[PDB]
Amino acid sequence: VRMNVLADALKSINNAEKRGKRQVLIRPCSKVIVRFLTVMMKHGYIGEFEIIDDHRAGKIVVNLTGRLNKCGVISPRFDVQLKDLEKWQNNLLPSRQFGFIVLTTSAGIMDHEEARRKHTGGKILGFFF
Amino acid sequence: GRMHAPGKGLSQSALPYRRSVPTWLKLTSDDVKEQIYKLAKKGLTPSQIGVILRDSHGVAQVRFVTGNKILRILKSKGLAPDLPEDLYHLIKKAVAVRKHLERNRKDKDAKFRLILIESRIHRLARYYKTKRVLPPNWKYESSTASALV
């Protein structure tokens, strides 16, 4: 059954951008998807999106550029110290010059670069480049 | 995907967006509850109550009209059954199958469908014991089952 809702989302907008779609419906919705997307938006990877409120879990409709090469989930949500976060961006991003690991800290769901300057580790959610 | 079938059916009931009551429905929440009591006294389940209501009396959802839902209206006053209607219906079906299978030992398909129904029971029993709406001492035994109508 559906277990990692953030997996369904990121794979669906990855599939869609590979196909060259201008926007994509992602048809379950969680607050964790919405925080992840806002992080991808702040770095300009995806376009300004839209959360459709039915009275169940939402549906989101995500405007896409051709900037997002790949977004993806790391399942399971492994715990990451500030020590380990080099070895993740070492093996999980395509360079040091770009790409962002999203990881849910206590401070909030955010990129690896802000998790450095805030000096807070946490659980790796995914990554995008 | 179904529990005990390969079936990937999508025959779901689909409630509308607007939880807000319609205009035409003149019955107040109290007279709906009074009619729910009248149906429960006749000897109907919250499933059968809800059907009879939305058909003949134009009341889509009792939860929309009132605050609460049909079992919780039955349960508050004490018209609700001791053991849930859905676990009743599986035990009812298991007693029906087992009676058929008393004189039909050749019917191997029946025997397999019995084991599937037995598994549905044990599965629901286990759920309701976590919610203590059945006693922890309760366990569906097929020899004790014919007394549970």
Partner: protein, 141 residues
């Protein structure tokens, strides 16, 4: 891996532990049967006593006669056909001589043309068979 649960450490370790036994190189080293049935008893080299000089017919293709030496090992009393290296070095091996005997190179597997001979003769009467072949040491008799 085919179970990426965060709480699956033992299934992943206990599977790997079980599936390492289906490897040859592991099963060999991690049972007594390979280390027991080893004629050398897990040793690199072994002194034994020549009990006959044996011609072994080379393999199917190429066809020489490979001059090996039937050896009673001291430590075990076990029987070994051990090859003698370079041209005309079976002339240096009198019968009932204590020979130091090594492997052939393939960790107890048969090498080249020589069927079921896993060993070479290194020294004969505690004098090196390279030194006898080069003529540096003379055979003490």
């Amino acid at each position: 891996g085919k179970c990426r649960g965060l709480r699956t450490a033992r299934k992943l370790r206990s599977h790997r532990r079980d599936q390492k036994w289906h490897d040859k190189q592991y099963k060999k080293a991690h049972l007594g049967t390979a280390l027991k049935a080893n004629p050398f008893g897990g040793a690199s080299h072994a002194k034994g006593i020549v009990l006959e000089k044996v011609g072994v017919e080379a393999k199917q293709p190429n066809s020489a006669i490979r001059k090996c030496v039937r050896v009673q090992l001291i430590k075990n009393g076990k029987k070994i056909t051990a090859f003698v290296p370079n041209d005309g070095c079976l002339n240096f091996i009198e019968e009932n001589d204590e020979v130091l005997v090594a492997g052939f190179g393939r960790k107890g597997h048969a090498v080249g043309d020589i069927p079921g001979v896993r060993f070479k003769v290194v020294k004969v009467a505690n004098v090196s068979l390279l030194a006898l072949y080069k003529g540096k040491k003379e055979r003490p008799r």
